[PDB]
């Protein structure tokens, strides 16, 4: 019986609000170190993001931003966060709206109700070695539906540069449309989210968020739980068909769910008809 070993006390090296330990009870692979952990997106060529403070839409709330008059709320029809920072029950989890959080131009206080993602990771997570999907991330506590988990953080790159990246295991498109579109590549520079696996039965969903800038080319990708998550459960999202159409020629899904759509068996059945 191989022991479970704690192989890193904190993969984030103190950069997150909480430590993120790594364990391995499955094989001899040591703590992954072939990437630089960063807690906020980085750049490796000029992205010319619009950071002009006078361009920000902002609110005039003298409140905690919980009234229907908060402009930042209205830019997504309403503020989607409840009093504990969780997405409302009614939040559209199929096609999420763009969230505009409060920023430095707002009159409100830093602890207003519309600042969840910018406050960082609160839930306790663990990087661990899975049976069949390499590293994964799981919950060390129960997490209610609608809770902010973490952001997909990496190296911001253009569409064209993403097209010639050798390793395409960690590329996340910011926009599904044609033209001047950008991507996060977490291959060389990323946070805990780079270890989050695909599940055909997902428990987290990615949401586009704006915080300190509102350059629409560069939404930040925030993961929220899509249902109550039990202690010990592996986290995962649906990577989507723009991943699997390319990747399924090289490997197939090992998620093991009855609804799996990307296993060898699922793909084989569909080749038949």
């Amino acid at each position: 019986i191989r022991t479970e070993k704690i192989i890193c006390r904190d993969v984030a090296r103190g950069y997150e609000n909480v430590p993120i330990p790594c364990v391995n009870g499955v094989d001899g692979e040591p703590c992954p170190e072939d990437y630089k952990y960063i807690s906020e997106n980085c750049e490796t060529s000029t992205m010319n993001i619009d950071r002009n403070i006078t361009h920000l839409q902002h609110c005039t709330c003298v409140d905690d931003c919980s009234s229907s008059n908060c402009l930042c709320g209205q830019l997504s029809i309403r503020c989607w966060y409840d009093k504990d920072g969780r997405l409302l029950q009614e939040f559209n989890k199929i096609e999420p709206p763009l969230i505009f959080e409060c920023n430095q131009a707002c009159s409100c206080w830093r602890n207003c109700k519309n600042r969840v993602v910018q406050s960082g990771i609160k839930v306790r997570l663990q990087l661990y070695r899975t049976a069949k999907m390499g590293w994964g991330v799981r919950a060390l506590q129960t997490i209610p539906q609608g809770t902010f988990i973490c952001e997909y953080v990496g190296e911001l790159i253009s569409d064209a540069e993403a097209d010639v990246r050798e390793d395409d295991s960690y590329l996340f498109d910011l926009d599904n449309k044609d033209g001047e579109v950008y991507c996060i590549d977490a291959r060389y520079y990323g946070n805990i989210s780079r270890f989050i696996n695909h599940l055909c039965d997902p428990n987290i969903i990615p949401v586009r968020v704006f915080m300190l800038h509102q350059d629409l080319r560069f939404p930040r990708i925030a993961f929220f739980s899509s249902r109550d998550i039990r202690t010990g459960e592996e986290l995962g999202f649906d990577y989507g068909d723009r991943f699997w159409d390319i990747k399924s020629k090289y490997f197939t899904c090992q998620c093991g769910s009855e609804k799996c759509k990307h296993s060898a068996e699922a793909i084989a059945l569909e080749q038949s008809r």
Partner: peptide
């Protein structure tokens, strides 16, 4: 596209 991309 030429590379795999995760996407919302």
């Amino acid at each position: 596209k030429q590379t795999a991309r995760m996407s919302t």
